[PDB]
Amino acid sequence: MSEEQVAQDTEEVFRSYVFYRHQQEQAPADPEMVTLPLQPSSTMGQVGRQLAIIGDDINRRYDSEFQTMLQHLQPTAENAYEYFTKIATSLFESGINWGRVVALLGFGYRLALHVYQHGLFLGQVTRFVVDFMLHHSIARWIAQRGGWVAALNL
Amino acid sequence: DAIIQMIVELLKRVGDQWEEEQS
């Protein structure tokens, strides 16, 4: 499986992940997490749904910590790319595992939610996630392990 | 940069806890 294929899968996984996380957590949420195009029957759509379900407990455990941190980081449309890239790079500095790959999806979700709540961005954050994983060689790491479906089979 | 590294530390902790529980 190619890195470009993983990148295309990543967009679908993240799109579906944010839909199901939004629904799981029902604060103003971003309507585009509902209304942007979505194929719930697709293969990667189902992977993203499963990742959201799996992560519900851990996400609730750390919700207050992340939101206090994001509240003080104050990400905006102007600096979100810089902050996302620095966070994502440092996250993988000591190594890649599926937990950390999935945690980056969760950070993307929280980042998109925060910028919506405080400004007037989901499409952009989607590109940040896909492009980072592609160019930083996370996509290769995923391809070596059989693709995104491997995340459901630890 | 301080809060960047604070977020990174939490994501690493969240991710490693996720990995172990799913494994």
UniProtKB/Swiss-Prot annotation, chain A:
Localization: Mitochondrion outer membrane
A GO MF term: identical protein binding
Gene Ontology BP terms: animal organ regeneration; apoptotic process; apoptotic process involved in blood vessel morphogenesis; apoptotic signaling pathway; B cell apoptotic process; B cell homeostasis; B cell negative selection; blood vessel remodeling
Motif (BH3): 47-61
Record keyword Manganese present: no
GO cellular component, one term: pore complex
Membrane topology term: Single-pass membrane protein
Tissue: Expressed in a wide variety of tissues, with highest levels in the heart and skeletal muscle.
Residue window of motif BH2: 140-154
Keywords assigned: Acetylation, Apoptosis, Host-virus interaction, Membrane, Metal-binding, Mitochondrion, Mitochondrion outer membrane, Transmembrane, Transmembrane helix, Zinc
UniProt binding sites for Zn(2+): D131, H135
Broad class of where this protein is predominantly found: mitochondrion
The keyword Lyase appears for this protein: no
Residue ranges annotated as motif BH1: 90-109
Subunit structure: Homodimer. Formation of the homodimer is zinc-dependent. Forms heterodimers with BCL2 and BCL2L1 isoform Bcl-X(L). Forms heterooligomers with BAX. Interacts with BCL2A1. Interacts with RTL10/BOP. Interacts with VDAC1. Interacts with GIMAP3/IAN4 and GIMAP5/IAN5.
Function statement: Plays a role in the mitochondrial apoptotic process. Upon arrival of cell death signals, promotes mitochondrial outer membrane (MOM) permeabilization by oligomerizing to form pores within the MOM. This releases apoptogenic factors into the cytosol, including cytochrome c, promoting the activation of caspase 9 which in turn processes and activates the effector caspases.
Domain-level remarks: Intact BH3 motif is required by BIK, BID, BAK, BAD and BAX for their pro-apoptotic activity and for their interaction with anti-apoptotic members of the Bcl-2 family.
Family under the similarity heading: Belongs to the Bcl-2 family.
Designated name of the protein: Bcl-2 homologous antagonist/killer
Organism classification: Eukaryota, Metazoa, Chordata, Craniata, Vertebrata
Gene: BAK1
Curated annotation (Swiss-Prot), chain B:
Extent of the signal sequence: none
Protein name, as recorded: Protein BNIP5
Natural source organism: Homo sapiens (Human)
Lineage of the organism: Eukaryota, Metazoa, Chordata, Craniata, Vertebrata
Gene giving rise to this polypeptide: BNIP5
Whole-protein residues included: 244 to 266 of 652
